[PDB]
Every structure is written in C-alpha cells, then in structure tokens.
Paper text:
Splicing requires reversible phosphorylation of serine/arginine-rich (SR) proteins, which direct splice site selection in eukaryotic mRNA. These phosphorylation events are dependent on SR protein (SRPK) and cdc2-like kinase (CLK) families. Interestingly, CLKs are dual-specificity kinases, which have the ability to autophosphorylate at tyrosine residues but phosphorylate their substrates exclusively on serine/threonine residues (Nayler et al., 1997).
The main structural difference is a change in the relative orientation of the N- and C-terminal lobes such that CLK3 exhibits a more open conformation than CLK1. The difference in lobe orientation is likely to be an effect of the inhibitor bound to CLK1 mimicking binding of the ATP cofactor. CLK3 also shows additional secondary structure elements at the N and C termini not observed in CLK1: first, a short hairpin comprising residues 136–145 that folds above the N-terminal domain; and second, an additional helical segment at the C terminus formed by residues 476–481. An additional hydrogen bond is formed in CLK1 between the A loop residue Tyr331 and His212 in αC. This interaction, however, is not conserved: in CLK3 it is replaced by a hydrophobic contact between the Tyr331-equivalent Phe326 and the αC residues Val204 and Lys207. Most notably, the alanine (uniquely replaced by valine in CLK3) that lies at the center of helix αG is packed against a strictly conserved tryptophan (CLK1, Trp419; CLK3, Trp414) located between the αH and the MAPK-like inserts. CLK3 is abundantly expressed in mature spermatozoa and might play a role in the fertilization process (Menegay et al., 1999). A greater role for CLK3 as a SR-specific protein kinase is also suggested by its stronger preference for arginine in P-1, whereas CLK1 shows no preference at this position. Overall, CLK1 appears more susceptible to inhibition than CLK3.
Residue numbers in the entry: 136 to 303, 305 to 481
C-alpha cells in the first residue's frame, strides 16, 4: 500500500482492505478523506459505507473522537432504535482511520433537489420531525450535541420514490418510506469536551453561536427547526452568508433579539444602542425587506396540522437557548398527535 501526496490512501474500485472489505463504489469525498462503498466479505458481502481518513494528524485525531462518539451511541442503543447511523467496524489502516457504517439511501437534501425542490408533504415532514426529535433526544440524554445537523446529514433508509405525476415539467416525486437516520457524527461534542466556537453550517446555525455566547444541546434544536422549515417549503429559512444580515433576518422572521443576549455578546460591532445596524433601503435592505417575513406567513394551509407544525417550529427557533424547547418536550407536542401507530414506533 501507498499514499499520494495529499495523504489519501491510493485506492480504486476493485481493491481490498483488511482482507475483508472489497471496494465496489465511490460514495463521496472531501478534505477529510473519501467514503467508498464496500462489500464486507466477513459478513457475507453485505454493503457498507467505509470512510477512509487522510493520513494527516488533524484529520486522524478528529476521527478518533468521531469513533468515540459512535462507540457511545452503539453502547447505548442496543435495539438499534434511536436512529443514529450504526458503526459496524473501525480500524487504523497504515495511519488512515477507517470507519465502516451501514449503507443507506439518498440524503434528504439530495432527494429534495431531485424533486426540483418541491417540498415534502406534511405527513412526511411530521414523521421526519418525530424521528429527528427521537434521535437527538437520545443523543442529548447522553451528554452529546451533534452540531452539524442539516438535510445532507439526514439519510433515508431507502429513498425509492413513487411518481405522483410526470407531465411532459419536472416529475413530482414522493419518497415511499420516510424512515431516516442521523449521520455524520464528525463534529459531535460531549458536554465535557472542548467546544469549537463556530459550529454548524451557516443556514442551520443558531444565534448563540453567531454571538459567541456559548452553546450546548439547544444548538441542535435550532438546526432541526431550520430543517423542518426547509422540508415544508423546499427552500432554506435563512439564505445568507454573513452574520449581521443573518441576525437581521432572524429578527424579521422571529421577532426581537433578547436584550440580555446583545449585552453579553463580544460581537458588539453588529449593534448600536441595542439595535442591529441595518440600512433597510439599501440593496440588501430591500432584498431582506422583500424576502424575509414573519414566520407564520410561510404557512401553506390554515389547518390545524399546519398551525401545530408552525408552533413547534417557533418553539425550536426561540432566540434564547435557555427558553428553546427541549427535544423531550418536543416529542410531547400536539403536532405529533397526527402520527400513525406504524409511524409512532
């Protein structure tokens, strides 16, 4: 075996590792390494996703911590019922940390994109919501915060779809089975561990992160609220790439930022005399004026189930993380009364 000059293991479809794993496909990659589909010939050629981390110290050490998280999840979920992706193996292959997991279907972002960003139906949003709440409540009870929840990291167990229509327009598609798993625990942080200051992907990042006020489990709750909005409408709640504009959007959509948070933040440059600095009649001003309205305005129906969805989402999107709904509380929200018995377990 050998590495390339970037520290990737030099490998191709056709190659083996551990006299066990046969590489049969590529699943994706990034600056961390690569993920390949393999057949596990010690487990009857079952399919796995194998993450092969680069032979670079910072990525190796990060992967060690990822493995520790995945071990805890496995230790605590013996019936495999909390819907976190299941690690089947890990090893150090010539300095490359390798982590083997269950091979699942398309992620919920990919599926939305393939559906031309037409949203998921409400019962689908509801079942996925319930599942996210259940999975993360489990994580949260084990002193863990994911920190990078986003539709790309929520995977369908099976993403086979049914066609509703196919007019000679884009094909309107619905997933047949809305069972999901939470993936990518590479940023997950135990309560006692060092907390990276800026966590989450932009669109799913909460105000206490932006304002550098400290964060914990409520971070994930905010992300989930953002994700549900996106599943319900097909577009992101916060389409921005800059902190001040993001905070302004939060205020336009959700109401005023609590004064105590503004007094406490080291990010004073975004404020003046307690209010966000924002020129509302500038080009960006008009755009935020045009596109960012109060949260309830985005409802598509006035019916009870929609009203309930938006109440839960508002509670998930509370500015103050200490006021934000917990996932234990969320699981008891009336929105979930509309689940079926099959869905409800």
């Amino acid at each position: 075996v050998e590495d390339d000059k970037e520290g990737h293991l030099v490998c191709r479809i056709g190659d083996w590792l551990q006299e066990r794993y046969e590489i049969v496909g590529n699943l994706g990659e990034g600056t961390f390494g690569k993920v390949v589909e393999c057949l596990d010939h010690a487990r009857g050629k079952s399919q796995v996703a194998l993450k092969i981390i680069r032979n670079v110290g910072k990525y190796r050490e990060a992967a060690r911590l990822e493995i520790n998280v995945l071990k805890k999840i496995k230790e605590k979920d013996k019936e495999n019922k909390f819907l976190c992706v299941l690690m089947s193996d890990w090893f150090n292959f010539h300095g490359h940390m390798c982590i083997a997991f269950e091979l699942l279907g398309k992620n919920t972002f990919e599926f939305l994109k393939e559906n031309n960003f037409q949203p998921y139906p409400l019962p689908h949003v509801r079942h996925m919501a319930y599942q996210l709440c259940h999975a993360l409540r489990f994580l949260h009870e084990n002193q863990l915060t994911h920190t990078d929840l986003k539709p790309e990291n929520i995977l369908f167990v099976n993403s086979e779809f049914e066609t509703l229509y196919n007019e000679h327009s884009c094909e309107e598609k619905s997933v047949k089975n809305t069972s999901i798993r939470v993936a990518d625990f590479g940023s997950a942080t135990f309560d006692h561990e060092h907390h990276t200051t800026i966590v989450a992907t932009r669109h799913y990042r909460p105000p206490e992160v932006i304002l550098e006020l400290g964060w914990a489990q409520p971070c994930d709750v905010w992300s989930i609220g953002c994700i549900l909005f996106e599943y319900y409408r097909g577009f992101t709640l916060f389409q921005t790439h800059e902190n001040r504009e993001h905070l302004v959007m939060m205020e336009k959509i959700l109401g005023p930022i609590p004064s105590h948070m503004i007094h406490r933040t080291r990010k004073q440059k975004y404020f003046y005399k307690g209010g966000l600095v924002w020129d509302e009649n500038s080009s960006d001003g008009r755009y935020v004026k045009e596109n960012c309205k109060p949260l309830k305005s985005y409802m598509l129906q006035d019916s009870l189930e929609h009203v309930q969805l938006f109440d839960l989402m508002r509670r998930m999107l509370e500015f103050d993380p200490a006021q934000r709904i917990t996932l234990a509380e969320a699981l008891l929200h009336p929105f979930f009364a509309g689940l079926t018995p099959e869905e409800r377990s």
